[PDB]
Coordinates of C-alpha atoms in Angstrom, one line a residue:
Chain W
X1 CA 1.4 70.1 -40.9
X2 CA -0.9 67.8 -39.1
X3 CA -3.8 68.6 -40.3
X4 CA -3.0 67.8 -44.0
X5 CA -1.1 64.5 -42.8
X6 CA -4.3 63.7 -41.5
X7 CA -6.8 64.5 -44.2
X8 CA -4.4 62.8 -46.6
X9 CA -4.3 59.6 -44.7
X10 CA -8.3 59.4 -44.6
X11 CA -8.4 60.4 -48.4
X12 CA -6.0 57.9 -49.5
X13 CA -7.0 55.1 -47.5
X14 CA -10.6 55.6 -49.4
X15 CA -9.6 56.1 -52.5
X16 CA -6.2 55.0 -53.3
X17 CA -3.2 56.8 -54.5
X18 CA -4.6 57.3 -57.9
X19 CA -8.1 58.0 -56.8
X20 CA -7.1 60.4 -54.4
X21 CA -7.1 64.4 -55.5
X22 CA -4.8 67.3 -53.9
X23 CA -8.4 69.4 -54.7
X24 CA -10.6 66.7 -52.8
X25 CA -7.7 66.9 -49.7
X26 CA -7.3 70.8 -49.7
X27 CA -11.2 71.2 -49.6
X28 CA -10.9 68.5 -46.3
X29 CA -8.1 70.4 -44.7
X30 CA -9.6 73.8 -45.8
X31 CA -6.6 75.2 -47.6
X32 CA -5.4 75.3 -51.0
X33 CA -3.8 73.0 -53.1
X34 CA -0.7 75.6 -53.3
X35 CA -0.4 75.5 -49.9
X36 CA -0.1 71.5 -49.9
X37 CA 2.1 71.5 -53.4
X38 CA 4.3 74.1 -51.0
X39 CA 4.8 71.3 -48.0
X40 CA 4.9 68.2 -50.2
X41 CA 5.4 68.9 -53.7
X42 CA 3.3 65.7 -55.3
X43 CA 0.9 63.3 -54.6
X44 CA 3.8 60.6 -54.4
X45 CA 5.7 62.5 -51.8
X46 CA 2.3 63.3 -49.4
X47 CA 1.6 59.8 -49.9
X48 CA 4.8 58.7 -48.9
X49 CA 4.6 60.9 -45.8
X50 CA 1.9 59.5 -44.5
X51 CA 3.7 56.5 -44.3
X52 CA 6.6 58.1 -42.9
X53 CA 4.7 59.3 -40.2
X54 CA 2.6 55.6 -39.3
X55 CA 5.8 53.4 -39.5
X56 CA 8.0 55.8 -38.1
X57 CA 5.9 55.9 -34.7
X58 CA 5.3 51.5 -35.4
X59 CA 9.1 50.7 -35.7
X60 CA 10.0 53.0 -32.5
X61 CA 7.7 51.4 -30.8
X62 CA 9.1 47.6 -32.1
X63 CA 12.3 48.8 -31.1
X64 CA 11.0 49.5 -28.1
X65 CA 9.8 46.0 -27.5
X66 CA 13.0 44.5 -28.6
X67 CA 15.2 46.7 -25.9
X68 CA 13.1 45.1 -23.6
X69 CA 13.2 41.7 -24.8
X70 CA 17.5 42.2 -24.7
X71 CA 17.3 43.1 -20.9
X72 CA 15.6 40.1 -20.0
X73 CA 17.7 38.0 -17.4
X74 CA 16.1 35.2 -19.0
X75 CA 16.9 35.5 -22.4
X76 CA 14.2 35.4 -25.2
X77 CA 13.1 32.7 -28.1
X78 CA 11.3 33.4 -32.2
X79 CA 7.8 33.7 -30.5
X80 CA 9.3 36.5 -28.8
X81 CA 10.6 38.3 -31.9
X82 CA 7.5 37.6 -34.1
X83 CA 5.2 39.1 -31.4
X84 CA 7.7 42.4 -31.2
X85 CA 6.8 43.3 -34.7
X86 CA 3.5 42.2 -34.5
X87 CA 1.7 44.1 -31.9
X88 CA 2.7 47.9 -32.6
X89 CA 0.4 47.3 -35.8
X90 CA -2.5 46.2 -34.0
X91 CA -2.3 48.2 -30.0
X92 CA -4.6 51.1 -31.2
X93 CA -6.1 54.1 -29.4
X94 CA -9.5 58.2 -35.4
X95 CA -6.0 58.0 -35.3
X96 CA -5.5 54.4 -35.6
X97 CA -7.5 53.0 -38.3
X98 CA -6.8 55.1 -41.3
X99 CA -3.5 53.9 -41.4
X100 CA -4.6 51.0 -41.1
X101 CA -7.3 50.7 -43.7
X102 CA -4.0 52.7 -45.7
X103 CA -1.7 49.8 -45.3
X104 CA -4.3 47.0 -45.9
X105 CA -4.7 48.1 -50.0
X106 CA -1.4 48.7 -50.3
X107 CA -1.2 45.5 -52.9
X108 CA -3.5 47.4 -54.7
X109 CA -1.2 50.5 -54.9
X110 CA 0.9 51.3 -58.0
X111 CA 4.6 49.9 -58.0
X112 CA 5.7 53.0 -58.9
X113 CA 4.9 54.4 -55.5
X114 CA 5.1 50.7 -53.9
X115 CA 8.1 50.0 -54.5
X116 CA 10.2 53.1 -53.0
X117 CA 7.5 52.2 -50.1
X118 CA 9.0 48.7 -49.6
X119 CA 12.4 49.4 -50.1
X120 CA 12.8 52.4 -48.0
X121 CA 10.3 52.0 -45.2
X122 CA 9.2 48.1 -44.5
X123 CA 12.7 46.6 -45.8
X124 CA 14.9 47.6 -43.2
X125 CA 13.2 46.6 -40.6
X126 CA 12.1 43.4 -42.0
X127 CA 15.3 42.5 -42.1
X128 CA 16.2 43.5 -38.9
X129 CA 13.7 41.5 -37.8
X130 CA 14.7 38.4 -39.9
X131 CA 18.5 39.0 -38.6
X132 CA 17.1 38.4 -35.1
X133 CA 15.2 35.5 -35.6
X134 CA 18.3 33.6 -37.2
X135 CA 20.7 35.0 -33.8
X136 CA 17.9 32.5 -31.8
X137 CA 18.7 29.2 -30.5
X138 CA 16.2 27.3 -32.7
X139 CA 17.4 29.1 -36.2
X140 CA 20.1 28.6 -38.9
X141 CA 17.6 28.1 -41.9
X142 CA 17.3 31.3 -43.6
X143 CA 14.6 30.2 -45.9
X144 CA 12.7 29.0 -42.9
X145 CA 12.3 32.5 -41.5
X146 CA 12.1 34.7 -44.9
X147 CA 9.5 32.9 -46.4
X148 CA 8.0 33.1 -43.0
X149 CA 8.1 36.5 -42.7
X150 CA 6.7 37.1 -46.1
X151 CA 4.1 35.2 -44.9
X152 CA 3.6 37.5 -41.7
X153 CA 3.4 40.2 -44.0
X154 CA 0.7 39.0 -46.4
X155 CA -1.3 38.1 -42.6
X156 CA -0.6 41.5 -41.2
X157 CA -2.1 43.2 -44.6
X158 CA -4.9 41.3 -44.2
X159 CA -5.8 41.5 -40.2
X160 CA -5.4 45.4 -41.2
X161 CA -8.4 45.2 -43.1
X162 CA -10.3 45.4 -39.9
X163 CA -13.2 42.2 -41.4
X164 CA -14.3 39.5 -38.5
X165 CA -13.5 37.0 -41.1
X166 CA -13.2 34.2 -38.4
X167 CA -17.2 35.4 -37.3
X168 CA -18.7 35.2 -40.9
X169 CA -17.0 31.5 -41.6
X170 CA -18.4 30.1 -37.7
X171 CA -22.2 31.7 -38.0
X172 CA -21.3 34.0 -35.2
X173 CA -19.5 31.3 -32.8
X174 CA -16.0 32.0 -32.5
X175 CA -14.7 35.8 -32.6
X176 CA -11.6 37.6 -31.4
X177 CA -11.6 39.0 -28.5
X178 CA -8.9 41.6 -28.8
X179 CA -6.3 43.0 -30.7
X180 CA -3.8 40.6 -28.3
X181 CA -5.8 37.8 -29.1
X182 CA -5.5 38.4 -33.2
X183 CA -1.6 39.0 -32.0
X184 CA -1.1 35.9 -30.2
X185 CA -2.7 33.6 -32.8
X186 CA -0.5 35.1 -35.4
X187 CA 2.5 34.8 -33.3
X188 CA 1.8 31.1 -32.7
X189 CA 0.4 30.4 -36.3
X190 CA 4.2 31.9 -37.6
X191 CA 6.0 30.8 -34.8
X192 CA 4.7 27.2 -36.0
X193 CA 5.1 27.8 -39.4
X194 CA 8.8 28.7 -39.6
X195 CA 9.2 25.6 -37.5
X196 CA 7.5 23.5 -39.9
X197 CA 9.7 24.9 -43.0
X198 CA 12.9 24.4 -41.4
X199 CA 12.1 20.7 -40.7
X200 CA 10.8 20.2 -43.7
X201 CA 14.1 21.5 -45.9
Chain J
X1 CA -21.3 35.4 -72.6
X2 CA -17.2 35.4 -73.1
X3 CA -15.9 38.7 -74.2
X4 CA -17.4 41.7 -72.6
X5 CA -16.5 39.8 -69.5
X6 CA -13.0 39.6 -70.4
X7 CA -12.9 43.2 -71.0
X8 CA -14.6 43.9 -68.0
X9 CA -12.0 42.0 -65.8
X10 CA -9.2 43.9 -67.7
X11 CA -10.2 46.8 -66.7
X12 CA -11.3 45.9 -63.2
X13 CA -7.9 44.2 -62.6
X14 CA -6.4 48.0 -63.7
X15 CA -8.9 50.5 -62.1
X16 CA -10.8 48.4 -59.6
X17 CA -14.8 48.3 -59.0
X18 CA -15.1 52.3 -58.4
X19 CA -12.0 53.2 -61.0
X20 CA -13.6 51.0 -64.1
X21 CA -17.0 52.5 -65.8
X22 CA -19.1 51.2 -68.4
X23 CA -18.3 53.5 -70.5
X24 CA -14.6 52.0 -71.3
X25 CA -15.7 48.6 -70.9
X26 CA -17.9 49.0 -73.9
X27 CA -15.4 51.0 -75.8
X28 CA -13.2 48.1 -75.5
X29 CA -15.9 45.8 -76.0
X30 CA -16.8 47.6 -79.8
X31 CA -20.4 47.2 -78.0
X32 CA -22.6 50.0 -76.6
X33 CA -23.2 50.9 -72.7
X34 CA -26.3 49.7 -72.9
X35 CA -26.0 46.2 -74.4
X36 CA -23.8 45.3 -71.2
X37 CA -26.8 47.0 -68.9
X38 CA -29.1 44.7 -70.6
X39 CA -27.0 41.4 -70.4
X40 CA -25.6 42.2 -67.1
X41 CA -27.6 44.6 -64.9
X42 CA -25.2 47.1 -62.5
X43 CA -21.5 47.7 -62.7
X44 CA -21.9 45.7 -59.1
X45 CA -23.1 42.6 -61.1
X46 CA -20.8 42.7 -63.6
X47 CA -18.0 42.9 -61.5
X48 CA -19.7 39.6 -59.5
X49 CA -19.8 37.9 -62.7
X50 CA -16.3 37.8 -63.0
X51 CA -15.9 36.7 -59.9
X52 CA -18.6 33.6 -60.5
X53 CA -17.2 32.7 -64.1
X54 CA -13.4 32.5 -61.9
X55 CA -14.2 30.7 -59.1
X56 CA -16.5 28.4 -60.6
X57 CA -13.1 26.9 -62.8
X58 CA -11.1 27.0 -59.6
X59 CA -13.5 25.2 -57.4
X60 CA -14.3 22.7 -59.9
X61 CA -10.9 21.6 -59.5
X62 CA -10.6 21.9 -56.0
X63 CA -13.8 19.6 -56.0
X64 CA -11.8 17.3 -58.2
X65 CA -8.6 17.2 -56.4
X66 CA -10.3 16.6 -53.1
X67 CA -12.0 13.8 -55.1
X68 CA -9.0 12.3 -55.8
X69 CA -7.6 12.7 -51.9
X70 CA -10.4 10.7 -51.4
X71 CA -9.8 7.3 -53.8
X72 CA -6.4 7.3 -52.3
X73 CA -5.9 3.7 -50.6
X74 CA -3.4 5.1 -48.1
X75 CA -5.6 7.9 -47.4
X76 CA -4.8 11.4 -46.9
X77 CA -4.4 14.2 -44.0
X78 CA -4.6 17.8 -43.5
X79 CA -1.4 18.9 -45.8
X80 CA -2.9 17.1 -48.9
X81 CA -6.4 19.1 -47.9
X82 CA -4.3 22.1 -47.9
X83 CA -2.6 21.3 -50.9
X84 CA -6.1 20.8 -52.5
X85 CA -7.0 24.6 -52.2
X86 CA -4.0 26.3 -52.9
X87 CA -3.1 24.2 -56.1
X88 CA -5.8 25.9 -58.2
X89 CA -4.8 29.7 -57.3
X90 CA -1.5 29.1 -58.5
X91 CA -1.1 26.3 -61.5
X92 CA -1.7 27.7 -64.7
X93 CA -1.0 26.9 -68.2
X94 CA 1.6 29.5 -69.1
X95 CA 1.7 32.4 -70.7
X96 CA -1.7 31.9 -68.9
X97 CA -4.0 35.1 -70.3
X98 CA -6.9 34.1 -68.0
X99 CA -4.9 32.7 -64.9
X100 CA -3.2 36.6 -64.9
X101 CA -5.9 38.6 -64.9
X102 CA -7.7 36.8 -62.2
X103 CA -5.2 36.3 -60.6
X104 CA -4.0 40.3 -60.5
X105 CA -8.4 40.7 -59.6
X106 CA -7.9 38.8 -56.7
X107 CA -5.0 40.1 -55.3
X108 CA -6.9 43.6 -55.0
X109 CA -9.6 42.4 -53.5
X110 CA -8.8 43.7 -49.9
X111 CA -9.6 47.1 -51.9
X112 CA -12.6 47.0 -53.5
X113 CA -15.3 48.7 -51.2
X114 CA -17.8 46.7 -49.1
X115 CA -20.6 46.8 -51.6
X116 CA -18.8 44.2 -53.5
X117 CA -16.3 42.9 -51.0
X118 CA -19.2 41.7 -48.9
X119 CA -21.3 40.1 -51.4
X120 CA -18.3 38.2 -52.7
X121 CA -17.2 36.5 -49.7
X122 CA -21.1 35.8 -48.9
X123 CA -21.9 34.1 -52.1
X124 CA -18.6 32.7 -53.7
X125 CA -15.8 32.1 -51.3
X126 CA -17.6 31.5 -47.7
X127 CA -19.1 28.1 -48.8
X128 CA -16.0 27.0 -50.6
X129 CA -13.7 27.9 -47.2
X130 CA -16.6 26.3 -44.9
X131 CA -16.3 23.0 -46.9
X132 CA -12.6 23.4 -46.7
X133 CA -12.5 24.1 -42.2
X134 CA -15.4 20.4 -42.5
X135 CA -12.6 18.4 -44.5
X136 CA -10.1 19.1 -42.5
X137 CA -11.8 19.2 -39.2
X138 CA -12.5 15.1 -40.3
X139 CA -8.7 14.5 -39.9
X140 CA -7.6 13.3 -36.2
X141 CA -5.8 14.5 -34.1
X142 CA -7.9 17.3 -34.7
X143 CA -10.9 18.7 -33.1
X144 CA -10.0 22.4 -32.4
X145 CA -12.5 24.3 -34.6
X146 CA -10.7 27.3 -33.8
X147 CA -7.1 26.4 -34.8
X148 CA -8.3 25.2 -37.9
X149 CA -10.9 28.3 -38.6
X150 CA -7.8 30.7 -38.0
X151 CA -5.9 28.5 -39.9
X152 CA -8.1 29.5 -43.0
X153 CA -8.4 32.9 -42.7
X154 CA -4.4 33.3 -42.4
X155 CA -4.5 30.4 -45.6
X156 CA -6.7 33.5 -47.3
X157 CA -4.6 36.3 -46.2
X158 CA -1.0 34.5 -47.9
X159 CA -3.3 33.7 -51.3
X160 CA -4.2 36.9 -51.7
X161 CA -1.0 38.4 -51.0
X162 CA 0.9 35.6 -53.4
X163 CA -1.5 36.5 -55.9
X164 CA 0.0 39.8 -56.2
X165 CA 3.3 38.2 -58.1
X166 CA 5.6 40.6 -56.3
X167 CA 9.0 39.0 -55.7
X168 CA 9.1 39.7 -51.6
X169 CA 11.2 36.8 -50.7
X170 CA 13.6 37.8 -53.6
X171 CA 13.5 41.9 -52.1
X172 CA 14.4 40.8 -48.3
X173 CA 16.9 38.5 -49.0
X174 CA 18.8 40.7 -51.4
X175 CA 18.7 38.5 -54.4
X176 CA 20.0 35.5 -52.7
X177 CA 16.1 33.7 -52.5
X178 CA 13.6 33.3 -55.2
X179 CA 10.2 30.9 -55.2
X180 CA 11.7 28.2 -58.2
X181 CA 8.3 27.6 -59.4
X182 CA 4.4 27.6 -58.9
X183 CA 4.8 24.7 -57.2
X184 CA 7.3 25.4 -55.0
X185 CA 5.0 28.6 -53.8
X186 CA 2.3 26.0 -52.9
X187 CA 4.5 23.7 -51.2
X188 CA 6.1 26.2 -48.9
X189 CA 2.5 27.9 -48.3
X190 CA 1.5 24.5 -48.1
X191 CA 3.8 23.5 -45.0
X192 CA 3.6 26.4 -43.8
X193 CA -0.4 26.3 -43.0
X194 CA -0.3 23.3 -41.6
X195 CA 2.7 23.4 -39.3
X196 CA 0.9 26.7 -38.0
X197 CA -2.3 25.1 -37.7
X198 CA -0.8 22.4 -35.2
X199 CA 1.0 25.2 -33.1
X200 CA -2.6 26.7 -32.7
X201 CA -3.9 23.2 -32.0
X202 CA -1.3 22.5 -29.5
X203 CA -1.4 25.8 -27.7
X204 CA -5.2 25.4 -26.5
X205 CA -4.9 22.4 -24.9
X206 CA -2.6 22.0 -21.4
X207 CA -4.3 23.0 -18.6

């Protein structure tokens, strides 16, 4: 059960969906390939479990954050949204960064198992999370917000990838220093952006 | 030098670096292994030479366009820089052969492994991206390295994402959205960096 999940996830984050083998996962998990064929029935299905399993515990955690946000006294505003669905991708605890690596190449991924992806796993929620941004006080421009949020996407894909890009293009001076860091300067970048494309329409 | 390299980006824009081998390269080529070791060295220099014969057309015209921000009487300021280095990813002469191939190369670069990944930003994008943060870090109000630094990585991220051609903004909004052109793609990318590199800019300062 776990195990395989596991192995999987390492596997295909390495090699792809098409790279990866059933024989080169059994041999990691030390079982046959029957026994895998038995629990998932194709490479497309495992594959698509492993995702299950990383957004499934992401998106209950983001609608965690977005409980939270609704039981303020206060109220909430965009930044607030944006930074809900950004930080269950990056608060890590090697559990964490295969899935990550996973998600990072997943432009690289066949549409044949990227689309069902999309439409059944990241859709939903991305919506959701659009929906919520036009309910705020600043937002009746739905262009505004989901060509921002494609834009998130395409940012989140790439922070997943795990490369100090902002170190190699400064000679060493300027770094992030944490996972809220990389957070908060997407949430402001986005934040600004929307902004920007709404009062430019 | 045209042809085996064409190939060779076929089959890297299909496979990858560690999918693609040689050996179908020169199939496809009607030439032997061998003659593409001797013009080309490695698989890993192939693959860079690609790269070098792609970026070299699109920084040409960067270089030009930049050029051309600079004759401007009026002058210019950091949308028109940003402008500059999108406009060359995504203008092409349709059907566009080349631009499509490249362009699908590109878009997979996040999973080529660090062998050639590293190399590639070293040589061919970091010096093109540098010059980029220096042009725009030349337009006041503006002298926050950092909002302008993360401002170019998250301009990198949205390129190579775009370059992917999947319809995303047509998927999430059921239909009902759809980019009308090249153009329109860099405009709202366009607006988009530079709107978010002000909220960075005005977020550091305030004591």
């Amino acid at each position: 059960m776990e195990l395989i999940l596991n192995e999987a996830e390492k596997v295909f984050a390495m090699h792809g969906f098409l790279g990866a083998t059933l024989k080169q996962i059994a041999q990691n998990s030390n079982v046959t390939q029957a026994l895998i064929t038995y629990y998932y029935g194709t490479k497309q299905n495992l594959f698509m479990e492993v995702y299950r399993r990383g957004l499934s515990d992401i998106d209950k955690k983001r609608q965690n954050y977005l409980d939270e946000l609704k039981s303020r006294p206060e109220g909430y505003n965009t930044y607030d949204i944006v930074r809900t669905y950004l930080r269950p991708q990056f608060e890590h605890r090697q559990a964490w960064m295969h899935f990550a690596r996973l998600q990072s190449r997943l432009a690289s991924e066949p549409e044949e198992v990227a689309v069902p992806l999309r439409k059944e796993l990241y859709d939903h929620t991305l919506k959701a999370f659009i929906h919520e941004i036009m309910e705020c006080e600043g937002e009746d421009d739905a262009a505004a917000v989901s060509w921002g949020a494609v834009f998130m996407v395409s940012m989140i894909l790439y922070m997943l990838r795990g490369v100090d890009r902002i170190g190699e293009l400064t000679d060493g001076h300027l770094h992030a220093e944490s996972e809220d860091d990389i957070v908060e300067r997407m949430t402001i970048f986005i934040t600004g952006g929307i902004n920007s494309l709404k009062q430019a329409t």
